[PDB]
Amino acid sequence: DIQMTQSPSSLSASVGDRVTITCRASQSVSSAVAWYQQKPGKAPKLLIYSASSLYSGVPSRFSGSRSGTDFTLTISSLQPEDFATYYCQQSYYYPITFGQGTKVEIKRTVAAPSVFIFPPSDSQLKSGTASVVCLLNNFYPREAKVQWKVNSQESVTEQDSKDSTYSLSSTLTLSKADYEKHKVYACEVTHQGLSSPVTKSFNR
């Protein structure tokens, strides 16, 4: 099959930025290419077709170009509303295939996480599954990591509506029996906007 390898997997920009997203077909294609802009959840739209044709109703600023097998979609002045996931699809060889998408985020000043911690509470110990929580509120950019000092799953709220930020709840789940063994627990955040990693800890 044809892998419509698209890059960048995630780019940052703001209003007016001339944003470019490239996508290369694994095998030769004959202008069978289309660009779909899927917002969060909603049904994918259509942007371009025939690898260069502005589809009806699509904003003019969007435009596709072909230089062999490297189909490029450029938004001359990306607007606040045009932040979604853009996929490239070739209609030449069945089964039809898409890229992997290219989410265009929003840009603002780097801000460090406000990191809070939560130990498992009495009710949770009674239930039988203690989950320690690490909250990383309003931390920019989404690039970051959280390490644990005693499975651990991270829930990352999307780009904060307030101001283009990210939260992240890193929660580590253990059983009541397997949790009492240790005494000091800690979550350490490594972040771009942090001069040094920040560790928040508690004692059982």
Partner 1 sequence: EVQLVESGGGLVQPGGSLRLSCAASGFNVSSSYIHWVRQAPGKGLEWVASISSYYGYTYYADSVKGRFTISADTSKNTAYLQMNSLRAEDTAVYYCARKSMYHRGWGWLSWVYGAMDYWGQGTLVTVSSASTKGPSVFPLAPAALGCLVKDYFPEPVTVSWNVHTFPAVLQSSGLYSLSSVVTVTYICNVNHKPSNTKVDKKVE
Q: What DSSP line would sit under the chain, residue for residue?
A: ---EEEE-SEEEE-TT--EEEEEEESS--SS--EEEEE-SSSPP---EETTTEE-TTS-TTEEEE-SSSEEEEEETT--TT--SEEEEEE-SSSSPEE----EEEE----B--EEEEEPPPHHHHHHTEEEEEEEEEEEBSS-EEEEEE--EEEE---S-SSSS-EEEEEEEEEEHHHHTT--EEEEEEEETT-SS-EEEEEE-
Q: How far is the CB of 129 from partner 1 (least distance, A)?
A: 6
Q: Which is nearer to partner 1, 56 or 203 (CB)?
A: 56
Residue 202 near partner 1 by CB under 8 A: no
Q: Which is nearer to partner 1, 70 or 158 (CB)?
A: 158
Residue 178 near partner 1 by CB under 8 A: no
Q: How far is the CB of 36 from partner 1 (least distance, A)?
A: 7
Applying CB under 8 A, which of residues 42, 80, 81, 203 lies at the interface with partner 1?
Answer: 42
Q: How far is the CB of 51 from partner 1 (least distance, A)?
A: 10
Q: Which is nearer to partner 1, 77 or 175 (CB)?
A: 175
Residue 95 near partner 1 by CB under 8 A: yes
Q: Which residues bind partner 1 (CB under 8 A)?
A: 1, 32, 34, 36, 38, 41-46, 48-50, 55-56, 85, 87, 89, 91-92, 94-101, 114, 116, 118, 120-121, 123-124, 127, 129, 131, 133, 135, 137, 153, 155-158, 160, 167-169, 171, 173
